[PDB]
């Protein structure tokens, strides 16, 4: 059973390798020109922040470029109709099918 | 102290050319005679063309021909100028002042024009 | 206009002896490909100082206009974008310092300053004249100062401009010195270099401005101040 | 190497000026006052470069038709411009200018005979 | 009735910018070699720099045959200096010619001796003023009469540029002086 | 190589005259004389840069100035060279400076 | 996930190096400038919001729901830049502390500031003491993951 | 492609343009095309 | 997180370097630069335009006109243009 830990962990790694690409591509652009380097400017904070925020909000999977249909509906709006309802949704378990 | 450096220079020059003299096949006697010679030597107008109405704004040339005054040969590090006030940042440096010889590694410097 | 295309199942799609299934996608908006590229730079800069989304949209609106005039074509695009952002911040009534815009942008103070003035002339628009109060909030926060000190500082700044004790002086210097005075009369002391690092202004410029305000220090404090350090024992340099 | 390229450019210029007379490498060195190029280099230029260069024709001991494949004649190649049904396959603005005199005067005259100019 | 409430205080001229064409091509390196009060650096800039003590000035001489003269404190002395520069060029052996002399810019300044209200001035003249206390300490005022650019400082000092003739300075100042006195502290 | 400037010096000139003696007596060749001049330059430059350690302060009035080929050329008048161990006043001086 | 996995991922295996194409068409004497970057210690603030002023403040998970914010906290990392140029110098390394992103916080976990408070304090914060937590808040909505 | 022909239409580029045209008109009528990738919307969804 | 210093230090460093020596080579030379250029073409059969300006440290338009006068150009199927100075 994949809980928040293994799901976010796959997701955060997806976000981090992508960030790693943006620093490399930026530093490569700098060196081509040369002598004017900075490091906070190379990093795009939006990449991590929005990429996770997007996944949690929509319910989709991945950064959208590598599909989304394999982990549809893994994220939901917490039902709260009655205290037992909230408590039940937090204890929900799901099982993938065709 | 400084003739010593000149002496030092005699040492470096003589050693450094030995192999060169060798390559020409020139005997070491010529090298030593060179050293000894050298050592002994060491010690309103609507007209747009006539401008003769402004003659004499220049001075004697004359200053440069003689150069009899003491001379200084060196290198510059930084040169600066503010109005008619000049600022000089120099480095390296051989000076000759009224017959004697002097040296510096850095010189800093102020003048007006 | 046109949509994009990609991938291609797993049945066919020539690459024949080649390894390029069907065909690569194509561009369609080169002439504008640097306006989209501007927006990419604007949100990034914006997140480094964490502005609300509304300012960023305002900036996109300022940029679209300036671009559309082409009245300053040739100057650095990122400079034009950065200057748009600076204007947007004043028009939102939440001024930022130029020094703050250099922190986030790769364009120097000289070019942003030029572009700022040029954009205002070209766009036939003017911002409000900046005031000291506009920065009181942000600084005391980054200095973890309590509300009471922040309010004293605002009062000090207000009195200082009211008595015209330091005319001509930049509002950032007066702001930095008022904050310094406040923090020095409270338990929450702060060093010149620490404030200087936050405001971006050199600590010696604060020291001079403080030397300028000290002769009348008693008159500037609110009557609600609790004097943790009395004026009679207020540090001087 | 450079010297030879300067020789070729000179040679084109001298042909343009009108001096189509056959001459030798030794003569060009002299006239350009560069005989001190060294016998080794002189020879290598003479009996390797200026023999593998297809622009000059070697006759007995001297170089002919000077700058390139040309027929010269006073740039008054009227029959050539004619050239019956073949019609010259097509003349080039650059070659006529290189030939001797500027083209413009000749072209203007040629525009009122039977010739047409295209910007190709 | 006087023109203004307190008349002029003769704004004083401080700097003049003019150009002149020598009419022929020259060899700046030779010039640099010959001249005694000049400097030349192709790796830095294309023109040769000369400076004379008379009225104390500086000139920019191009290989094209154009020269520019700056620093004079009057138009006659700038015409004078340019003629002197042409003279030394002649004295080098070059066919110098005093052609196309023209004043391109004039700079002036004066003081009013009292502190002033700048926040108000920028408020009431928003269309023209562009006061940026953060960047440059003084207020930049763009007049559109004799189209002149002014720099006004809190101490009261005023600098003017963009002028082609002295009258434009007095006129631009004659316009601005009542307003400024009117914001006296 | 280098500033070649030190060829103008007394030190540099006394060398060339000594070399000239050897050339008139044909004890050496001009090419050999030039190579000796090149090695002397390197040795004197090394000697200046590595051995020399003293500094001097100076003031005065500028009479004339020149800059070309990366070489500065001045002529000052009424100069005062001031040191912690020396003081020297002179009416006029010519200064050449390369880098 | 926060205590191990995130730290493990940035410490793991992405050290990177970069080197311009110097000595192009010519060169020789030296060795093409090169730069190395590696990421270390990671830091995660309590959940924070930033007003238009730019003033950062303690956010409360109820305030996040009524205004529609996003209950998340800012993340920072130790980064080093490290030179051992091809000869003249091997040291000139610099320590930085840098903001990299905002991570959503799951309610009443060890990093959601509500965990350290008692029944009376949560009741005072206007957040119900009997709520179970464990759900993210994004854009004003409480969003729960399905196992 | 019309301007391209009109002008200096090469050969391989014409074959490419025909193939791209053949794809777009087909995908307009039918975007299912078992042996080919599907025309998509910028959001990622398949074109209807 | 990120202090503001009116300009990047290293950018300022870029300025400090730029403000000493410039690639604005003055060409009242033509011949010696060219004499050098022949020497360069002795080192390899062909060169790329970006390096050819780079090895000459000079403005492109005059050199381009030189390449127009005596030289030739060739796309070796590498998109990028390459030149030769052989008068053959």
Swiss-Prot record, chain C:
Effect of residue 114 to E: Inhibits interaction with SSU72. Inhibits interaction with VP16. Inhibits RNA pol II transcription activation induced by VP16 but does not affect basal transcription
Entry keywords, A to Z: Acetylation, Acyltransferase, Chromosome, DNA-binding, Host-virus interaction, Metal-binding, Nucleus, Phosphoprotein, Repeat, Transcription, Transcription regulation, Transferase, Zinc, Zinc-finger
Tissue expression as described in the entry: Expressed in the inner cell mass forming the embryoblast. Not detected in cells from the outer thin layer trophoblast (at protein level).
Effect of residue 216 to E: Inhibits interaction with RNA polymerase II
Annotated Sequence repeat ranges: 45-121, 139-215
Impact noted for substituting residue 74 to Q: Decreases BREd-dependent pre-initiation complex formation
GO cellular component: cell division site; chromosome; germinal vesicle; kinetochore; nuclear body; nucleoplasm; nucleus; protein-DNA complex
Phosphoserine PTM sites in chain numbering: 13
The protein's name in its UniProt record: Transcription initiation factor IIB
Source species of the chain: Homo sapiens (Human)
Curated annotation (Swiss-Prot), chain E:
Subcellular localization: Nucleus
Main location: nucleus
Tissue localization of expression: Widely expressed, with levels highest in the testis and ovary.
A molecular function GO annotation: aryl hydrocarbon receptor binding
Stretches forming Sequence repeats: 13-89, 103-180
Keywords: Disease variant, DNA-binding, Host-virus interaction, Neurodegeneration, Nucleus, Repeat, Spinocerebellar ataxia, Transcription, Transcription regulation
GO terms for biological process, alphabetical: DNA-templated transcription initiation; mRNA transcription by RNA polymerase II; positive regulation of transcription initiation by RNA polymerase II; RNA polymerase II preinitiation complex assembly; spermatogenesis; transcription by RNA polymerase II; transcription by RNA polymerase III; transcription initiation at RNA polymerase II promoter
Domain of life: Eukaryota
GO cellular component: chromatin; cytosol; euchromatin; female germ cell nucleus; female pronucleus; male germ cell nucleus; male pronucleus; nucleoplasm
Positions that bind DNA: 15, 51, 66, 105, 142
UniProt family annotation: Belongs to the TBP family.
UniProt name for this protein: TATA-box-binding protein
The organism of origin for this protein: Homo sapiens
Swiss-Prot record, chain F:
Taxonomic superkingdom: Eukaryota
Main location: nucleus
InterPro entries: TFIIA_a-hlx (IPR009083), TFIIA_b-brl (IPR009088), TFIIA_gsu (IPR003194), TFIIA_gsu_C (IPR015871), TFIIA_gsu_N (IPR015872)
Compartments where located: Nucleus
Entry's transmembrane regions: none
Cellular compartments per GO CC: cytosol; nucleoplasm; nucleus; transcription factor TFIIA complex; transcription factor TFIID complex
Keywords: Host-virus interaction, Nucleus, Transcription, Transcription regulation
Any one GO molecular function term: RNA polymerase II-specific DNA-binding transcription factor binding
UniProt-listed SUPFAM superfamilies: Transcription factor IIA (TFIIA), alpha-helical domain, Transcription factor IIA (TFIIA), beta-barrel domain
Pfam families (UniProt xref): TFIIA_gamma_C, TFIIA_gamma_N
GO terms (BP aspect): positive regulation of transcription by RNA polymerase II; positive regulation of transcription initiation by RNA polymerase II; RNA polymerase II preinitiation complex assembly; transcription by RNA polymerase II; transcription initiation at RNA polymerase II promoter
Function: TFIIA is a component of the transcription machinery of RNA polymerase II and plays an important role in transcriptional activation. TFIIA in a complex with TBP mediates transcriptional activity.
Similarity section: Belongs to the TFIIA subunit 2 family.
Record-given protein name: Transcription initiation factor IIA subunit 2
Lineage: Eukaryota, Metazoa, Chordata, Craniata, Vertebrata
From Swiss-Prot, chain H:
Compartments it resides in: Nucleus; Cytoplasm; Chromosome
Tree of life domain: Eukaryota
PTM entry text: The tandem heptapeptide repeats in the C-terminal domain (CTD) can be highly phosphorylated. The phosphorylation activates Pol II. Phosphorylation occurs mainly at residues 'Ser-2' and 'Ser-5' of the heptapeptide repeat and is mediated, at least, by CDK7 and CDK9. POLR2A associated with DNA is specifically phosphorylated at 'Ser-5' of the CTD by CDK7, promoting transcription initiation by triggering dissociation from DNA. Phosphorylated at 'Ser-2', Ser-5' and 'Ser-7' of the CTD by CDK9 (P-TEFb complex), promoting transcription elongation.
Function: Catalytic core component of RNA polymerase II (Pol II), a DNA-dependent RNA polymerase which synthesizes mRNA precursors and many functional non-coding RNAs using the four ribonucleoside triphosphates as substrates. Pol II-mediated transcription cycle proceeds through transcription initiation, transcription elongation and transcription termination stages.
Family statement drawn from the similarity comment of this UniProt entry: Belongs to the RNA polymerase beta' chain family.
Name of the molecule in the record: DNA-directed RNA polymerase II subunit RPB1
Organism name: Homo sapiens (Human)
Biological classification of the source: Eukaryota, Metazoa, Chordata, Craniata, Vertebrata
């Amino acid at each position: 059973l994949d809980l928040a830990g293994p799901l976010l962990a796959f997701l955060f790694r997806g976000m981090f390798k992508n960030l790693l690409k943006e620093v490399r591509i930026y530093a490569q652009k700098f060196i081509d020109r040369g002598k004017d380097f900075n490091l906070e400017l190379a990093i795009k904070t939006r990449i991590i922040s929005d990429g996770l925020k997007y996944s949690l909000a929509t319910g989709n999977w991945g950064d959208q470029k590598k599909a989304h249909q394999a982990r549809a509906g893994v994220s939901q709006v917490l039902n709260r109709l009655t205290f037992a309802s909230t408590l039940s949704h937090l204890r929900r378990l799901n099982s993938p099918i065709g | 102290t400084v003739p010593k450096l000149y002496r030092s220079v005699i040492e470096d020059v003589i050693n450094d050319v030995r192999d060169i003299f060798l390559d020409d096949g020139v005997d070491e006697q010529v090298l030593m005679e060179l050293k000894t010679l050298w050592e002994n030597k060491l010690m309103g107008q609507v007209e747009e063309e006539p401008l003769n109405s402004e003659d004499d704004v220049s001075d004697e040339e004359g200053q440069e021909l003689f150069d009899t005054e003491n001379v200084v040969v060196c290198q510059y590090d930084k040169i600066h100028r503010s109005k008619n006030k000049w600022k000089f940042h120099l480095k390296d440096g051989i000076m000759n002042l009224n017959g004697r010889d002097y040296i510096f590694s850095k010189a800093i410097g102020d003048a007006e024009w | 206009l046109s949509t994009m295309i990609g991938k291609g199942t797993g049945a066919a799609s020539f690459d024949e002896f080649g390894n390029s299934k069907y065909q690569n996608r194509r561009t369609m908006s080169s002439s504008d490909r640097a306006m989209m590229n501007a927006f990419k730079e604007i949100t990034t800069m914006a997140d480094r100082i964490n502005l609300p989304r509304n300012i960023v949209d305002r900036t996109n609106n300022l940029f679209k206009q300036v671009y559309e005039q082409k009245s300053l074509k040739g100057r650095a695009n990122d400079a034009i974008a950065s200057a748009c952002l600076y204007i947007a911040c004043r028009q939102e009534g939440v001024p930022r310092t130029f020094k703050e815009i250099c922190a986030v942008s790769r364009i120097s103070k000289k070019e942003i300053g030029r572009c700022f003035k040029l954009i205002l002339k070209a766009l036939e628009t003017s911002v409000d004249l900046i005031t000291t109060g506009d920065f009181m909030s942000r600084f005391c926060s980054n200095l973890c100062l309590p509300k009471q000190v922040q309010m004293a500082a605002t009062h000090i700044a207000r009195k200082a401009v009211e008595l015209d004790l330091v005319p001509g002086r930049s509002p950032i210097s007066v702001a930095a010195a008022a904050i310094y005075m406040a923090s020095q009369a409270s338990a929450e002391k702060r060093t010149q270099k620490e404030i200087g690092d936050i405001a971006g202004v050199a600590d010696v410029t604060i020291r001079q401005s403080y030397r300028l305000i000290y002769p009348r220090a008693p008159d500037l404090f609110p009557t609600d101040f609790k004097f943790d350090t009395p004026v009679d024992k207020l540090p001087q340099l | 190497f450079g010297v030879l390229a300067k020789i070729v450019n000179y040679m084109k210029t001298r042909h343009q000026r009108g001096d189509t007379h056959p001459l030798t490498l030794d003569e060009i060195l002299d006239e350009t006052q560069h005989l001190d190029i060294g016998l080794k280099q002189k020879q290598w230029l003479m009996t390797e470069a200026l023999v593998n260069n297809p622009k000059i024709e070697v006759i007995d001991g001297k170089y002919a038709f000077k700058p390139k494949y040309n027929v010269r004649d006073k740039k008054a190649l009227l029959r050539l411009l004619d050239q019956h049904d073949q019609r010259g396959l097509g003349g080039i603005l650059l070659e006529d200018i290189e030939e001797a005199l500027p083209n413009s005067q000749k072209a203007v005259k040629a525009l009122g005979d039977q010739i047409l100019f295209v910007n190709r | 009735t006087p023109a203004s409430e307190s008349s002029g205080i003769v704004p004083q001229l401080q700097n003049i910018v003019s150009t002149v064409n020598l009419g022929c091509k020259l060899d700046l390196k030779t010039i640099a070699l010959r001249a005694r009060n000049a400097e030349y650096n192709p790796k830095r800039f294309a023109a040769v720099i000369m400076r004379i003590r008379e009225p104390r000035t500086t000139a920019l001489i191009f290989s094209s045959g154009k020269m520019v003269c700056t620093g004079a404190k009057s138009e006659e002395q700038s015409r004078l200096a340019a003629r002197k520069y042409a003279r030394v060029v002649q004295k080098l052996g070059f066919p110098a010619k005093f052609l196309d002399f023209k004043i391109q810019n004039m700079v002036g300044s004066c003081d009013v001796k009292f502190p002033i209200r700048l926040e108000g001035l920028v408020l009431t003249h928003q269309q023209f003023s562009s006061y940026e206390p953060e960047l440059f300490p003084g207020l930049i005022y763009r007049m559109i009469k004799p189209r002149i650019v002014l720099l006004i400082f809190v101490s009261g000092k005023v600098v003017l540029t963009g002028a082609k003739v002295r009258a434009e300075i007095y006129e631009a100042f004659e316009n601005i002086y009542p307003i400024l006195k009117g914001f006296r502290k | 190589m280098a500033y070649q400037l030190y060829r103008n010096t007394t030190l540099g000139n006394s060398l060339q005259e000594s070399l000239d003696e050897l050339i008139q007596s044909q004890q050496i060749t001009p090419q050999l004389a030039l190579q000796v001049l090149l090695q002397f330059d390197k040795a004197i430059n090394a000697a200046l840069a590595q051995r020399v350690r003293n500094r001097v302060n100076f003031r005065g009035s500028l009479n004339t100035y020149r800059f070309c080929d990366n070489v500065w050329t001045f002529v000052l008048n009424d100069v005062e060279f001031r040191e912690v161990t020396e003081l020297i006043k002179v009416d006029k001086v010519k200064i050449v400076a390369c880098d | 996930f926060i205590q191990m996995s995130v730290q493990r991922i940035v410490e793991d295996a992405p050290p990177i190096d970069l080197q311009a194409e110097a000595q192009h068409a010519s060169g020789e004497v030296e060795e093409p400038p090169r730069y190395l970057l590696k990421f270390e210690q990671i830091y995660l603030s309590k959940p924070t919001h930033w007003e238009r002023d730019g003033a950062p403040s303690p956010m409360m998970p109820n305030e996040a729901r009524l205004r529609n914010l996003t209950y998340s906290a800012p993340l920072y990392v130790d980064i080093t830049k490290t030179v051992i140029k091809e000869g003249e110098e091997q040291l000139q390394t610099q320590h930085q502390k840098t903001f990299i992103g905002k991570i959503p916080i799951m309610l009443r976990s060890t990093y959601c500031l509500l965990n350290g408070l008692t029944d009376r304090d949560l009741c005072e914060l206007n957040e119900c003491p009997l709520d179970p937590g464990g759900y993210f808040i994004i854009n004003g909505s409480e969003k729960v993951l399905i196992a | 492609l019309r301007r391209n022909e009109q002008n200096g239409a090469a050969a391989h580029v014409i074959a490419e343009d025909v193939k791209l045209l053949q794809f777009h008109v087909a995908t307009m009528v039918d975007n299912e095309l078992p042996g080919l990738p599907r025309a998509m919307q910028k959001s990622g969804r398949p074109l209807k | 997180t990120n202090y503001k210093p009116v300009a990047n230090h290293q950018y300022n460093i870029e300025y400090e370097r730029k403000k000493k020596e410039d690639g604005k080579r003055a060409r009242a030379d033509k011949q010696h630069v060219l004499d050098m250029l022949f020497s360069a073409f002795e080192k390899h059969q062909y060169y790329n335009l970006k390096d050819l300006v780079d090895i000459t440290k000079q403005p492109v338009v005059y050199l381009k006109e030189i390449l127009k006068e005596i030289g030739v150009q060739n796309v070796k199927g590498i998109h990028k243009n390459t030149w030769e100075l052989k008068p053959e």
